[PDB]
Design a protein around this ligand. Structure first.
Ligand SMILES: CCCCCCCC/C=C/CCCCCCCC(=O)O[C@H](COC(=O)CCCCCCCCCCCCCCC)COP(=O)(O)OC[C@@H](O)CO
Ligand SMILES: CCCCCCCC/C=C/CCCCCCCC(=O)O[C@H](COC(=O)CCCCCCCCCCCCCCC)COP(=O)(O)OC[C@@H](O)CO
Ligand SMILES: CCCCCCCC/C=C/CCCCCCCC(=O)O[C@H](COC(=O)CCCCCCCCCCCCCCC)COP(=O)(O)OC[C@@H](O)CO
Ligand SMILES: CCCCCCCC/C=C/CCCCCCCC(=O)O[C@H](COC(=O)CCCCCCCCCCCCCCC)COP(=O)(O)OC[C@@H](O)CO
Ligand SMILES: CCCCCCCC/C=C/CCCCCCCC(=O)O[C@H](COC(=O)CCCCCCCCCCCCCCC)COP(=O)(O)OC[C@@H](O)CO
Lengths: 307, 307, 307, 307, 307
């Protein structure tokens, strides 16, 4: 098996689209192997640019096709270059733009922590014909940066493994195992914009919802409660386009559902207070003094939603 | 007829867009047949990569064109590979990305159950010239997964049939029947996000709409009813972009229309109560005690909308 | 002139985008003519697949280029095939996806009735060099179906005509007339979703707007009228993205403008009733008994907006 | 210099996107020049279709490349054709689809008046090597039509000029002047949809805002004013997506800002009336009789915003 | 090293998309170097158009590939041209459309000031094989213009530097340094549309929020405060799509958060005034005379948010 030595240079990560869990990676890939010696013009390496490589592949040069496994579409290959040396070794350099995809887990949404994965694999040659020796990843352009809201933490992890395929088992009986390269980059979401735009106003709205019990008139309490319900419905719409649509419940989601529960609890409490009159002559003191109990225990419910 | 043996490997299903009823499938297809024996370099199979196959087709190699019938556009074919054996058999491997389309029936919308269909067919050769022997489908990467809200249930069904075409009947009189492969995957929608985001708030709003009859003042009842109508109109907008636009009525749709009916029924009931005065001195007791009847029977109406 | 015999097979119509009045047609086109006899391998017809046809056109085969006149962009030609017979006749089969455009008249918008038109024409050869003999259209896959909200009614009309061009009159003096094929399919919009989503709620809102005159307090009437105006403004936004923007007035549009007129008429009537006091001691009876006149005549206005 | 005689045929103008000030033009271009005489098959002109022209350019035929200067992207060239005559003259016909751009001035927005410009220029040859003799424009398909809201008024103006370039001055010292063709089409916006959808409701809302002074209770006046402010905010959102975002102020914009000013003026006037009590015993007569002054002078302000 | 002399002509800058911080640049690039002398037809320079250059590169002409480093995608290269002179020098002219990206800092958002950067670099040749002599930038078409809201101030800065690469250090040990060209254009945002559309209405809403203390009834103050909170929530939605989502706080953002704080402060102040009764018989004078203190100090807070 011929030993290819990959080197990936990440130029920028951008376009992190949490709705579909894709992200666009731009960069360069440099593969390098050693073949039979050849005669080049002079004693110097020869550079073959894009759309000329095909004239060399037709004449019989061995250039393998490396593909990105987790790409959504096909990578927008820009320029490509092939450097041939007189001593025998070949270097294939190419520029890629891709929309890669990874399994993101938005369980802790504003305080999220994901990782961006590049998976690279030969398309045709198993590990008895092509083996990856090593990979370096030069992620120096995005070492400690803030792309839009993602801090790129630490270095980039690399790994070389062997993936066994089964749809090729009938056509390649006992040799259907392919060498694979994985590159992982840890990114932490910046929670500031959500903190001052989606959590502080919801906290103020929920506290104001608690503040309806200071009224001494029942009808005004009902109309006020419905106005607050309308405002919470406005935030129900206003948070819909932020993140995709998942079985479980995020942090902003808990605040929205807690706001709905607070509005409904206040409405039912004032209805029950209006119905609390046994003979219609008794007034209410203890159930309208929930201005200390209804907030505080609610905060404990918030603790249950946090931990 | 030459016997082709297809094998499809589904890599991921994603981008399930219910508005247009398309879905994107990414994967590999491996066709395989047997031709005349040939002399290859050594005693080993020969691999011909992408953009080299054309040099072999020009010289006279028989490679059929398989097409996907239910595709919206053209499949984004990435790499492709052709393995030729000395014993005679040929293997064509290719990678596809496609936006396929199927007839979806959103009658039970949050609790939906659809299936994703791949239909594959030769473009030029009828079943007297090309016949599909079998198909295996290796859907192991998405066996029991949750792509975004779709559980992929069970294995993948496969079928081989013969489709007879009529626009080719004048050009191919008695042989216009094409062999076809169908692949079906059963998927069940995950109803959780709609359950806690589109059904619980509508239930609370409808119950609060029932709660307007506890007021003892007519004008406040009217103004409260109009505020509730405004909130239900907000959810009328808020549910518009979820699913496409169909003649029949889904589950969230029934809740919205039931909310409109509840608001209008309450308005007409309080107007009729205000008009119920025969001489202007009589008050109302029985028609304002609908706080047990107006909810409960409405729930029975909900049963009619469920079953 | 050589006699081409076209046959079009419509596979599906979808993506009917009323904002730009385009629609996507997917299908196959089969042209067929007769040339000089030739020697094929054996006594059997010869099939030339895509990207091989060019080797036959370079050697001198006559294949005309048929274009779609009313296409927005260029048709996404998928596979194409060329069948050559020993007796002499040639058959060109191709698969197209196109975004076609037609002049749509949304005067009766929910109860609309449009037709989808395909116009096909040789690009280079006038009717002294290429003449269309006939066209069959095999629209059997969409014969009586419901694509999203369009019932496809009846069969597909076909027509063959001659279109005379003037920009080619200086370069082709007396022969600048091109044979053309037109295919028309009649489609009727399904009005159900608009009926239960855009007309019933507007009717309820307008009737509730009529219901403000039962109040006996002037200030509450004004505040109620402004709340109803806010709701009608919400539907003014909610109907904006449904259909494009036209000089005339559709059916939902009339309901929106009628709602605005009802709100303003009620406001002016209650202002005039408050000003109706000649000396400030007289009350109002007849002008507040418009609860029978203000609805009913409004319905007559609706008749004027219908017929 | 060789004399090219261009002839442009506009097929349709559509997709007029005022946000980016682009518009899509579809049509045909027919260039024509005279070269050396040649021998064609027979005594008849020879037609060379698309993807065959390259075989003639490789052998040495002179075909110039005409480009569109003001295009956003690259023109979607469909079919192209080359007619060669035995007497010597060559005719190049091509079909284009382009997204052209022009400097639009939306100062009078619903009653707008723009013009659509096509600029055509040789890419390589200056006017000492290629000169445009004349241009005809056959805009007969869109002569007096209504595309969506644009009336195409009159004929199409044409012009031939010489544009001098400076980045080519170092590489072409005294000959860097290129012949250019300009085509201008005058279009007038159809103001009807904005008239009945964005000006009549704003007029009704502003007049209703004037109508708050008829109330005799201060708190109800304040709450009514805030409800009207909420409605005007709804139209502030509802008008945002219509036209792009410009330093100056359009007609609908003036109505929105005037509505804000009316709400704030009414609020400040009722606050000042409540504070107008010198000793707390005096009531207000003259400042609450602004029901004739506050509308009328406002209309004069509208005149200032019109002229 | 061969000395290339680049000259860039910016035709238009448009599509400045602040959400992703890209901008589209359209223009021409003219590279020029000197090679060995050659024999051309006549004594005149020879022009080689697009799709003909490849026939010259195959025969052995040295044309380097210049790439744009900061491009999002691949530049839409339109026409390209190659002028070869008998004295020996070669001129490569090309037309580009690109979506370039730069690091934008929206700290002072309506009064912003960014710069647009073009970075150009050879793809294959280091500065021992290709060196940039100089660059001129002819930005005369956008010298002092207003594209949509960006004034292009002054001339265009140019710079030539050497960038050292590390992923090429293992394949090119001591020569991995590439010559680079940078072009910077200073642009200032036009703040007018935000001034009259996003700051004046927020100022009026905040001042009206201050105006709630003139009421003498507690329940009406609460309901009024909640209505104002609903309006501020409407502007919270209405400002979301203007600029991307950043850790820090812009100018409109400060106004929105200040509005929320004003609503909550007024609610807490009126609750504390209602609770201020020591025995329930005392009224409030000083804490309701904050109509001079609550605005004025708030303005000082605004100063803290400005400076
Ligand atoms: C003082 C009185 C208080 C008034 C009460 C006010 C009302 C307040 C809200 C109450 C309901 C609480 C619902 C909150 C939902 C909490 C959210 C939640 O449960 O999380 C997910 C389920 O979500 C969901 O099904 C959403 C469930 C919501 C559906 C509501 C059903 C509850 C019954 C309600 C009937 C009416 C009330 C009856 C009272 C008499 C589980 O994700 P899981 O980790 O498994 O990963 C998924 C896996 O697929 C990952 O691959
Ligand atoms: C106490 C008093 C109560 C107050 C009443 C409050 C008001 C409450 C709403 C009432 C109307 C109910 C409408 C609900 C509509 C239910 C939805 C429905 O019917 O389903 C679809 C029809 O939808 C539709 O046409 C929608 C129909 C709605 C149009 C409204 C017409 C009803 C008349 C209304 C005139 C005014 C009232 C008059 C009262 C005096 C049938 O799909 P189908 O399976 O065939 O597959 C289609 C096929 O093409 C698949 O290929
Ligand atoms: C009890 C008192 C009642 C209160 C009144 C309440 C208010 C209620 C609304 C009233 C205005 C009615 C406007 C309704 C507009 C009806 C819609 C309409 O007229 O249709 C189109 C014109 O639209 C339009 O210009 C829209 C016109 C609306 C502009 C408003 C101008 C009317 C004057 C208003 C000044 C203020 C009132 C003054 C009262 C003192 C004609 O398309 P047409 O077939 O030609 O094909 C086009 C061709 O280009 C196809 O190629
Ligand atoms: C009875 C009391 C009445 C209450 C008052 C109610 C409030 C009512 C509104 C008032 C403000 C009026 C603003 C209306 C703005 C009018 C719109 C306008 O002026 O047009 C553009 C400027 O826009 C703009 O800067 C918008 C300017 C608006 C910014 C507001 C500043 C005014 C000060 C406000 C401070 C608070 C008030 C203080 C009162 C004590 C000029 O384009 P120009 O042709 O140059 O081409 C551009 C070139 O770049 C083309 O290439
Ligand atoms: C009379 C009584 C008055 C009532 C009070 C009314 C309420 C009014 C609002 C108050 C909170 C103020 C928050 C305003 C936030 C100001 C905005 C701000 O601080 O700027 C950014 C932080 O944003 C942010 O974290 C947003 C922070 C907001 C989160 C809120 C936490 C504050 C605690 C609140 C708990 C409840 C109150 C408790 C009172 C008892 C810093 O960017 P920085 O330059 O570093 O570059 C980033 C780097 O990554 C660039 O690469």
């Amino acid at each position: 098996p011929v030993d290819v030595s990959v080197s990936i240079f990440i130029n920028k990560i951008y376009g992190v689209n949490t709705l579909e869990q894709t992200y666009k990676v731009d960069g360069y890939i440099v593969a390098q192997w050693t073949g039979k010696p050849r005669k080049t013009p002079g004693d110097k390496p020869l550079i073959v640019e894009n759309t000329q490589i095909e004239r060399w592949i037709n004449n019989g040069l061995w250039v393998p096709a490396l593909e990105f496994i987790n790409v959504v579409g096909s990578p927008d290959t820009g320029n490509k270059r092939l450097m041939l040396f007189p001593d025998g070794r070949v270097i294939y350099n190419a520029r890629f733009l891709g929309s890669f995809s990874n399994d993101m887990d938005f369980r802790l949404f504003p305080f999220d922590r994901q990782q961006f994965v590049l998976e690279l694999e030969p398309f045709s040659y198993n590990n008895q014909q092509l083996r990856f020796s090593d990979i370096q990843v030069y992620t120096e352009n995005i070492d400690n940066e803030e792309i839009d809201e993602w801090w790129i933490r630490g270095k980039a992890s690399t790994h070389i493994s062997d993936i066994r395929y089964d749809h090729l088992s009938s056509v390649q009986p006992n040799q259907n195992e392919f060498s694979r390269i994985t590159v992982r980059i840890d990114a932490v979401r910046n929670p500031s914009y959500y903190l001052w735009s989606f959590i502080l106003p919801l906290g103020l709205i929920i506290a104001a919802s608690w503040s309806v019990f200071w009224l001494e008139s029942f009808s005004e309490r009902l109309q006020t409660s419905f106005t607050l319900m309308l405002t919470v419905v406005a935030y129900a719409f206003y948070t819909s386009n932020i993140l995709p649509r998942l079985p479980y419940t995020t942090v902003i989601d808990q605040m929205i559902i807690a706001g709905y529960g607070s509005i409904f609890a206040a409405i039912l409490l004032i209805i029950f207070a209006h119905h609390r009159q046994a003979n219609g002559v008794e007034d209410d003191l203890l159930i309208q003094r929930c201005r200390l109990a209804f907030p505080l225990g609610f905060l404990a419910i918030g603790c249950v939603l946090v931990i």
